[PDB]
From a paper:
Coxsackie virus B5 (CVB5) is a member of Enterovirus-B (EV-B) species, which can cause various human diseases, such as viral encephalitis; herpangina; hand, foot, and mouth disease (HFMD); aseptic meningitis; and acute flaccid paralysis (1–3). Similar to other EV-B species, CVB5 is a nonenveloped, positive-sense single-strand RNA (+ssRNA) virus. P2, and P3 will break down into nonstructural proteins responsible for genome replication, whereas P1 is the precursor form of structural proteins VP1-VP4, which could be packaged into an icosahedral capsid. Here, we determined the atomic structures of CVB5 in three forms: mature full (F) particle (2.73 Å), intermediate altered (A) particle (2.81 Å), and procapsid empty (E) particle (2.95 Å).
The samples corresponding to both the bands were pooled and mixed for analysis by analytical ultracentrifugation (AUC), which suggested two types of particles–one containing RNA and the other lacking RNA with sedimentation coefficients of 143S and 80S, respectively. Compared with the map of the F particle, both maps of A and E particles had an expansion of ~4% with large openings on the 2-fold axes. The procapsid E particle and uncoating intermediate A particle of CVB5 were structurally almost indistinguishable, each with an expansion of ~4% in capsid radius, compared with the compact mature F particle, which is different from E3 and E30, whose procapsid E particles were comparable to the F particle but smaller than the A particle. However, no empty particle with a smaller radius was found after several rounds of 3D no-alignment classifications using different batches of particles, which is just like E18, CVB1 (13, 20). This is different from what has been found in the cases of E3, E30, E6, and E11, where an empty particle with a similar radius to the compacted F particle could be observed. We noted that the first seven residues of VP1 visualized on A particle would traverse the capsid and stop on the surface of the capsid, which was distinctive from the E particle where the corresponding residues were disordered, and all the other remaining residues were present on the interior of the capsid. But by analogy with other enteroviruses, the presence of pocket factor and myristoylistic acid in the mature F particle but not immature E particle and intermediate A particle, suggests that both the two molecules play important roles in the stabilization and integrity of mature virions for most of the EV-Bs.
Numbering used by the authors:
A (entry chain 3), D (entry chain 3): 1 to 181, 186 to 238
B (entry chain 2): 12 to 43, 52 to 258
C (entry chain 1), E (entry chain 1): 55 to 281
The structure:
């Protein structure tokens, strides 16, 4: 009796709609929820967690646990570069498969600060200094110890502390940037050689961690570029 | 009377009765990585004067490229990745009471100019020579990568008589000799790479040709002086 | 201020309607194999399986939308003039009778939910509640259904969500007609616990977590290189 | 369950309807608006702006900037006509391609007062008088200086002021008139010759501007008769 | 009093539903080129392009209505009796997977919006929000995407609004069927900045502002003439 119009867009199945669906099993009582520990309500909780960064991405090492270990040579030229990777959490293969990068690859846009932690895994008696230098996007990676020092850097003294947390700021012209392919660079430099009670043989290692800060967000959900299937698995 | 204006170590002379056209009614401000300001760049950069003749078409400057080599603010364009600035353009004109002519001094935001060859893009040199002005022509331009700089279309495919829609000023030599235009930062993003984006261009097109009595100076100097305002940049902190 | 984390939430992350299965069933056949079926699983589509297996326990309602389209086949039958085609999508709850023939007694569906849809209308839709004697679906089970049998590792009967069955109510014409169902799956009211690392190695079997070992990431030339 | 009728006009796509459209990208956060200078909310703001009128529409001059310059002869018969064009902002080619005329050609009906500004671009020492005469529609353009003076006119003295603003009133039998093809006439007359310190060679120029007044409106939007395409540009 | 300026407003001036694209796609084909596509552009229809380019920056939502009509072709196939035809209009957001075949994996549209429409109903409709990492679409860009390349002048990736894809879900009959989509475009919630002169010279290319120089207006015989 009540008049009604066609309202174009009816009798259509828009995949991204929020219409109520009739219940195939009404008058059926579901079991009550149980207080399971670990309630997660947002993927950033996963992205806020430190994950070990594989920086030793050289050929032949990605299949071993040595990909996570940054080698610190017992003797090397002062001002040599210990390591270096670009600040592309969703693009650069160093940070791509981390928890942060895994979350990022599920989305198209992202924004926020990257939290990097470098931990020295050498002896308690070992001492030494490192230049953890950060290059802003567009600047280009430094080529010497002096160029790294003249920019943003910290003197990470191994003897004083075995860890160094470095918060990478958000520098972009837009509110969000694309996850896919500037971002910046992290380079470490031998300020001083590692000094030990002069009797050791093997070399020290540095472990890297990546995390998101509290201002991290992702906008446009998409399919991750990592899992692939030819058809149904069964 | 005479008004003296000093910014930094530069001083210019302006009349008391000088009309100032403030962009779109907006005075340049900051966006209130933390952006870093540079008040040292707030100086008067007087470009080389252009000789206005009886047969002279207009000129244009694209100011991110124009001040690209002007000491400070040029070093800052080269140095900082992101930059933002408003500009005070002051166009002077030195003429006697025996000189004729009218000028349209207009600042055009996003003056994307076409090419002489339709299936081509203008090159960087043709679009902006920097501190050197690029001149219009009274006839069609020919070139593989040259800007179509015919005066009637203002290089933009529009009517040159309709250019008054943009913040403009009229310099009638019998009435005025100066033009002050205060252009704020106009863009679709809060801050942009200055080395690859001219936010606006200044067009000085003589609508009435210059004329003069016998014995009077044939040319009339046109001087452009630009003062960046509220310039701020990217900022390098945290590691 | 802080940027909004709205679409990063587990509800927005997981409650996305995706196609999880499609099958074709005939209108005529030699045996009674003229019906399509699908045991409701979350481990057959890699994208959805990875997204769900990023957590250990989940609890959600199944919203299913069926996109049924029919095609007339070849030739040799004239004057087809088929009337409109009606489809039956019968849902079999866990422990319910399972048909083996297109005209089985189970299709009379005394207690199996069933939706009858005539072509030309909006696609049929039905919602399955959280059906488990347990308190949550477990994407991972570090245990045996029966400790005696080695092959029961990782299998528990608490994740069985029923089976969907599709068929033609009427043939319409004496000529061949084949229909594709194209089930679209959408979890609702999702609660997830104990987050897990994303699956790195490619999946091999739907009922296994077996994997060929893979590198942690892609390699580069040098530890100091930039491109 | 609730009864409803056919209500003729349903399941139709009326192009000029205002029905809500389902969002293909819901749960997607658009970037916040930025305070861009130059917010325009109405086309009359464009139409209120002075635009230079090409009055020197003689053959061979429309391709040069001389089409905007009204030539004022150094010596001519007194009572000669400097220029003249009809008051057809959307029809006459003199006012057709101006900002006002460009806005008008996008519509079918219009109403309001035309604001005309004439600026003398001669020397500061130059003096002289002009008759800026306006003819109401249906009267016909005057043929002599006397006929112009006996009607609506102003004595524009060049020495006293270098500009003259002339507001053309709204004279029509209807609230709106069609943009397409009476309207009136503007004619300028040499009241006196231009007087200069007797040593100059080249002649003076007059620049004309057109604008809409605050009571200007346009009714029926249509396609402009100026841009034309054979097909899609790509 | 003052006459109303309601329909002169930018909203009324620009929010007018116009056809911006039409394409035909087959139901059968040799390769998989049985689909229509359209990169969403505002610079292909001269009237709409001129109206939008009268401003420098714009910010609007895209309302799209699709008018899909199917026609049976020629002959040599008998007993066609095709069932109703279903169409899929998949929208690909910026940066999303782009199909190359009629049966590409992108059509499974894990995150690409897609509308399935059966013929005989009201035309399908979908609305695209303002999608740009920038704060407004820029009809004019006096700059280079990459300053090194000359050919990048006037191109910025902030105006990319995605691509529309159209195809047949079902063939219906074994005979030829060709469908035209006829997309109708309508901006909503339009805010415009920095007004510009109307384009005088005729357009040449969609991705260029190049122009053959044209006279400012039409000529007349004399500066004192009246007709």
């Amino acid at each position: 009796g009540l008049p009604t119009m066609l309202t174009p867009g009816s009798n259509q199945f828009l995949t991204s709609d929020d219409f109520q669906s009739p219940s195939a099993m009404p008058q059926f009582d579901v079991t009550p929820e149980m207080d399971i520990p670990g309630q997660v309500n947002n993927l950033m909780e996963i992205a806020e967690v430190d994950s070990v960064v594989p920086v030793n991405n050289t050929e032949g090492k990605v299949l071993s646990i040595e990909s996570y270990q940054i080698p610190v040579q017992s003797n090397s030229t002062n001002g040599s570069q210990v390591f270096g990777f670009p600040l592309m959490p969703g693009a650069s293969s160093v940070l791509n498969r981390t928890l942060l990068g895994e979350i990022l690859n599920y989305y198209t846009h992202w924004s926020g600060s990257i939290k990097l932690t470098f931990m020295f895994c050498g002896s308690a008696m070992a001492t030494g200094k490192f230049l953890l230098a950060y290059s802003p996007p567009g600047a280009g990676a430094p080529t010497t110890r002096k160029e790294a020092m003249l920019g943003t850097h910290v003197i990470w003294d191994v003897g004083l502390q075995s860890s160094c947390v470095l918060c990478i700021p958000w520098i972009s012209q837009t509110h969000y940037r694309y996850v896919v392919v500037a971002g910046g660079y992290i380079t470490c430099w031998y300020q001083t050689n590692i000094v030990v009670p002069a009797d050791t043989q093997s070399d020290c290692k540095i472990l890297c961690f990546v995390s998101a800060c509290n201002d991290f967000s992702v906008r446009m959900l998409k399919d991750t570029p990592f899992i692939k299937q030819d058809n149904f698995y069964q | 009377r005479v008004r003296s204006i000093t910014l930094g170590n530069s001083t210019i002379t302006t009349q008391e009765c000088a009309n100032v056209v403030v962009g779109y009614g907006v005075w340049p401000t900051y966006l209130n990585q933390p952006t870093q300001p540079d008040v040292a760049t707030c100086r008067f950069y007087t470009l080389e004067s252009v000789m206005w003749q009886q047969s002279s078409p207009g000129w244009w400057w694209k100011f991110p490229d124009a001040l690209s080599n002007m000491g400070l603010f040029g070093q800052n364009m080269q140095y900082h990745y992101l930059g933002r600035a408003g500009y005070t353009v002051h166009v002077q004109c030195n003429a006697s009471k025996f000189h004729q002519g009218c000028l349209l001094v207009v600042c055009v935001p996003e003056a994307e100019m076409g090419c002489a060859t339709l299936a081509n893009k203008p090159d960087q040199k043709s679009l902006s020579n920097g501190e050197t002005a690029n001149m219009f022509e009274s006839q069609n331009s020919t070139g593989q990568t040259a800007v179509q700089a015919n005066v009637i279309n203002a290089g933009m495919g529009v009517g040159v008589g309709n250019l008054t829609i943009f913040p403009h000023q009229w310099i009638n030599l019998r009435t005025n000799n100066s033009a002050t235009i205060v252009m704020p930062y106009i863009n679709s993003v809060p801050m942009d790479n200055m080395f690859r984006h001219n936010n606006f261009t200044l067009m000085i097109i003589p609508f009435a040709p210059l004329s003069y009595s016998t014995g009077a100076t044939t040319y009339v100097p046109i001087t452009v002086t630009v003062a960046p305002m509220c310039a701020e940049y990217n900022g390098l902190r945290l590691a | 201020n802080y940027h909004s984390r709205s679409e990063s939430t587990v509800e927005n992350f997981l409650c996305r309607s995706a196609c999880v299965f499609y099958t074709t069933y005939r209108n005529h056949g030699t045996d009674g194999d003229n019906f399509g079926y699908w045991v409701i699983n979350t481990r057959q589509v890699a994208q959805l399986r990875r997204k769900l297996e990023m957590f250990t326990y989940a609890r959600f309602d199944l919203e299913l939308t069926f996109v049924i389209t029919s095609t007339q086949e070849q030739s040799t039958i004239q004057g087809q003039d088929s009337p409109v085609l009606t489809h039956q999508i019968m849902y079999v709850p866990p422990g319910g009778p399972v048909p083996t023939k297109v005209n089985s007694y189970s299709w009379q569906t005394s207690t199996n939910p069933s939706v009858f849809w005539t072509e030309g209308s909006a696609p049929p839709r039905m919602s399955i509640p959280f059906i488990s004697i347990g308190n949550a679906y477990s994407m991972f089970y570090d245990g045996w259904a029966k400790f005696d049998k080695q092959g029961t590792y990782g299998i528990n009967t608490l994740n069985n969500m029923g089976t969907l069955y599709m068929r033609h109510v009427n043939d319409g014409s004496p000529g061949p007609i084949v229909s594709t169902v194209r089930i679209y799956f959408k979890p609702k009211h999702v609660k997830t616990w104990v987050p897990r690392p994303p699956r790195l190695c490619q999946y091999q079997k739907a009922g296994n977590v077996n994997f060929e070992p893979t590198g942690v990431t892609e390699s580069r030339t040098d530890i100091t290189t930039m491109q």
